């Protein structure tokens, strides 16, 4: 029941807390073609891209030293763009996925936690 | 439709309804539409 | 009949063939009531005689149809102006192409296959054979 959702909330919370560059954004849906293309850019990088439950992402960003109570719990397909291994490679993957779509709405998370910018985030990323 | 005495949902859309107290099946497959189930 | 038109005639003469049939005749009555013709080389004509036809009831170009005939007259003289380029010059100086030159150019455009007139008529009320034969002779 809701207990299951509770430990898996905790699991995604740890997953978001351990990572430094975790920049998740809803962009009017993420396509399986888009997932394919972005993961090919991430070839070998064992990180994943997905859209997942809103509560778990909510408390993951909340417990990931950020705030996500309603920032990443609404607006349909909430894309989870996290990164692994090199912070450089994480930033490059984030910039590439931002450039994948036409004009992507920066939703939640940040690189190194606690976002201060939304346009410089795309400049730091590249 | 055609008069019957037992309706069978031989199509997925075969909704057993009652129009004017006549029990029929309404469905897209007009071949399977019948009456008096 | 029930389903005929004039735009249908000039569009089917093009999609089937594509010969640029220049409409010199504007049918007064186009669906199930064809009883008249509006001509450019000649004047407008109606048909009071169903079935057997003997008279081409010509009528002049009035104020209500002077522009209606004039737009198609410009339509026709813009093609006829290219032939005998003195006609082109005349169109510079605003002189409408003479009807005799129009007739000679249509004769060349039928014997040379440049452009043909698409007349109109009927065969069940039997209207539109007078100017048919007139244009055949012309």
């Amino acid at each position: 029941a809701k207990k299951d959702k509770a430990q898996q909330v905790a699991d995604v919370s740890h997953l978001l807390s351990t990572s430094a560059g975790f920049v998740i954004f809803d962009y009017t849906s993420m396509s399986a073609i888009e997932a394919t293309s972005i993961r090919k850019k991430l070839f070998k990088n064992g990180s994943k891209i997905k859209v997942i439950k809103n509560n778990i992402l909510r408390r993951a960003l909340k417990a990931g030293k950020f705030e996500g109570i309603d920032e990443t719990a609404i607006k349909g397909k909430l894309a989870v763009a996290v990164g692994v291994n090199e912070i450089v490679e994480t930033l490059k993957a984030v910039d590439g996925v931002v450039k994948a779509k036409e004009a992507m709405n920066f939703v939640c998370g940040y690189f190194d936690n606690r976002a201060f910018n939304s346009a410089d985030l795309e400049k730091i990323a590249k | 439709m055609k008069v019957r005495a037992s309706v069978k949902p031989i199509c997925k859309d075969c909704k057993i309804i009652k129009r004017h107290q006549i029990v029929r099946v309404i469905c897209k497959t007009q071949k399977h539409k019948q009456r008096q189930g | 009949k029930t389903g005929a038109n004039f735009e249908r005639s000039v569009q089917s003469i093009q999609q089937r063939l594509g010969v640029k049939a220049v409409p010199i005749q504007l049918p007064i009555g186009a669906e199930n009531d064809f009883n008249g013709i509006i001509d450019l080389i000649e004047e407008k004509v109606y048909f009071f005689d169903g079935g057997k036809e003997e008279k081409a009831e010509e009528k002049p170009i009035p104020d209500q149809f002077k522009d209606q005939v004039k737009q198609m007259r410009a339509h026709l003289v813009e093609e006829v102006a290219n032939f005998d380029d003195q006609l082109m010059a005349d169109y510079l100086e605003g002189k409408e192409i003479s009807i005799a030159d129009i007739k000679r150019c249509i004769r060349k455009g039928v014997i040379g296959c440049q452009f043909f007139p698409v007349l109109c008529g009927s065969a069940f009320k039997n209207k539109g054979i007078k100017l048919l034969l007139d244009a055949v002779v012309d």
Binding site: A32, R39, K40, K44 | - | -
Partner: protein, 128 residues
């Protein structure tokens, strides 16, 4: 639009590349040079809209289950895995793996090898 399993040389047959908005021969001359390095078994071809269609044409990797049959030296095997009759050699296996790596959704060469063996069970070959 239409995706075709076109040839490597001429592309004339098929009412899908002749008229989708583009003329045949002026793209056929490109087809003889852009695909002369993609010959062999029938290669996929995808049409798209540049204006309606004149450029932006690339070829997906060949469908290696009939090129895999040719790696078994075969045109018809069965409709299901059967006794071993062919073997995709070392160079053929590795070039097919690297060939599919970009076509696939995958990331690793091992996923390509799993791919090639996954369709290898429709004719009865083991992909080494």
């Amino acid at each position: 639009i239409a995706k075709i399993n076109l040839l490597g040389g001429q592309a004339k047959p098929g009412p899908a590349l002749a008229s989708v908005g583009i003329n045949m021969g002026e793209f056929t001359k490109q087809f003889n040079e852009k695909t002369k390095d993609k010959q062999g078994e029938m290669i996929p071809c995808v049409i798209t809209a540049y204006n309606d269609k004149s450029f932006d044409f690339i070829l997906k990797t060949t469908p290696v289950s009939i090129l895999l049959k040719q790696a078994a030296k075969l045109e018809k095997g069965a409709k299901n895995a059967k006794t071993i009759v062919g073997k995709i050699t070392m160079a053929k296996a590795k070039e097919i793996a690297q060939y599919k790596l970009v076509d696939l959704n995958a990331n690793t060469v091992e996923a390509a090898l799993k791919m090639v063996l996954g369709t290898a069970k429709q004719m009865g070959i083991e992909v080494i």
